Structure formats: C-alpha cells, structure tokens
Design a protein around this nucleic acid. Structure first.
Lengths: 156, 156
DNA sequence: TTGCATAACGATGCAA
DNA sequence: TTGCATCGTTATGCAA
DNA sequence: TTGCATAACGATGCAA
DNA sequence: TTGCATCGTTATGCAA
C-alpha cells in the first residue's frame, strides 16, 4: 500500500490536469489508481500540500489546485486544452487597452489561470503577469490587446 | 498561415485531450493557437479526418473524437484524467459477473472509452475489449469484476 | 482551398 | 411517452 | 497515520 | 437583493 508521501505525489499529478470539485471525486480518482483512502485523510493531504479550492467564475463551487512550483508542464495539445479548461472555469470577463488584454478571475485564481496561459505558449502572447483577481496579458506585435481579449472571450 | 495539413494536425492534437462539443469551440481553440478558420472549413476538416461526434451518456450532445490509430498517448496523471473525463461523458452504466466489469456507453462510443481506460493503465485492469456500446473490462486477481465496476461507477 | 450564405438537420422545451 | 414548433449546430452550392 | 463519526461550514433554493 | 432553512462538503476529536 502506497504511503502518505506516495499518495500525495499522485494527488498533485491528478489535480494538475483535472477539475476536482470535491474530496470524494479525488478519492474516486485515486481509487482508479489502486489507492484507497477516506475523505478524512484527503482533507488532511490537501492541507499539508497547500492545495486550495478556488471559486468558479460563475459564483458556484470551484476546483482544487496545488501551489505547484513549476512542472510537469506538458501535454498533447501543448497546454492548449488545460488552458481552455481553466478559462471556462476561471475567466470572469475580458477587456483591453492598447497592447494589453485584461482578464478577471475570482480572487486567488489569477496566478493559476496565468500559469496555464503561459504553459500553452500562445504565439500572440508575449507574457502574462497575474495579480489577485486580474491578469495582464501582453500581446505580441502586431496583435492588439483587443484581439487577444476577443480570443479569450471566445473560450470563456 | 498554416496549410490544411498543418491545421488538421492541430485539430487531432486538440481533440485528443479535450471535450469539443461544437465546431465553433474547435475554432476558438484553434484561434488561441494563431490559426483562424471558419466553421465551414472545420466541417470539412473533421470529415476528411474521419472524426465523429459521439452522443453523451445522458442523451444530449456529445463530443468530437478522431479515429486515432494510437499515440500520442501520455499525460501528467498517466491517462487517469482523460479516462475520468471520458467516463463522465460516456459511461451509461456498470454491472459485473465473476472477474468481469461490464460497462455500457452510447453506440459507437465504446472503443474510445476502452482506449482511454487502456491508456490509463489501471493496476487492477488486465485489459479491455470494446464492442459497439459495451466494454468488457478484465479484473486482475484478486480484484473482482464487482469491485472494478464499483470503481467505474464512482467516476460516472 | 476557403469564406459566405443559407439550407438541411439534430436537439431541447412544452403541451397533449 | 409522443408530437410540435423553436433554437442552435452542421453541411454545402456558389463564387473567388 | 488513518478511519469513523459527527460537528463546523459553505452552497443552493425559495420567499419576502 | 436579502434572509432563512435545507442539503452537500469539509474539518476534526477520539480511538486504535
């Protein structure tokens, strides 16, 4: 049987490319991998892991994310899909000014969406900077912030 | 500008780890990658690509999948997440007998869910065989078909 | 080959 | 549960 | 460290 | 829009 450290390692791997909305779902997911634990232990794992539960862009219940310090950062679509999933879950609205796209997310969710956007390495994005509930996305010339905002708006 | 072949290559990469429910979503996703095309062209790409639109386990609109002939078959969770996503989208019900878990999906959806399950390489699964709307999953001793079916039932 | 315009069409909601 | 009318999604004739 | 039992708690629906 | 009561999710005292 996998020890705590080993289980927690799987938790992080699962939360990285999933939209886990409850502790029981995390359990169902771990069970598929042969790891059986209760919600009580999960409630504790997520904690000594720093993982938090963000709110959804629509106001309801959000997802669990882990304060990842970097990689694994790669998938089939090159990050395009994970970004699209997080956009639908965390993008509250979009706006622009000059060469800047301004995106709003629930509080505390900005960094995660921003990492996801960086990971997808979009060709018209020079880079992003996330605050608490806002992300500034810099468009690469000749792309305008308005164009980028429209692109994100279509994935909201 | 990416030619047809290049665009189609991206389509397959995007449909592989996503749940695209319309042709416009595919467009929004391609746009994020710097590729701009209309629905008309997409309606044609998906066709000369063999991609089809499965029905959802709940009866409503499904997702687009490509008759993939194999890999790329790998992600962070090791396939656990893509499988979980497809389970929620295609698993209609579960049952068991002896060392067999029996899963039902909409017609034509069985092979896709089965590939996904194989890709996740679950430790208690010896292998799967998919028909049209049914999948036989073989449990590895001492796991019973009942146990496996319960595990899939929790991800439905 | 692709976009435009629009017809062909499958899905969803309501009423009987 | 079935059928009807309505809305969104997908397919395609035509022009460039 | 973990499961059990249950309390503490945040979310959703309805009514004013 | 706000508040109230109800349901699901998460946190934890206690025992092993």
């Amino acid at each position: 049987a996998a020890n705590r450290a080993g289980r927690q390692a799987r938790i992080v791997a699962i939360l990285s490319s999933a939209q886990v909305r409850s502790q029981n779902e995390l359990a169902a997911l771990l069970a598929a991998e042969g790891i059986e634990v209760t919600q009580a232990t999960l409630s504790r794992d997520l904690e000594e892991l720093g993982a938090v539960k963000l709110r959804g862009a629509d106001g309801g219940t959000g997802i669990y994310v882990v304060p990842e310090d970097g990689s694994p950062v790669r998938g089939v679509s090159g990050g395009t899909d994970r970004m699209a999933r997080l956009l639908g879950e965390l993008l509250v609205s979009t706006d622009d000014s000059g060469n800047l796209a301004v995106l709003r997310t629930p509080p505390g969710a900005a960094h995660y969406l921003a990492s996801a956007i960086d990971r997808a390495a979009l060709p018209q994005v020079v880079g992003t900077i996330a605050g608490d509930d806002t992300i500034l996305v810099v468009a690469r010339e000749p792309t305008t912030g308005a164009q980028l905002a429209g692109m994100f708006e279509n994935l909201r």
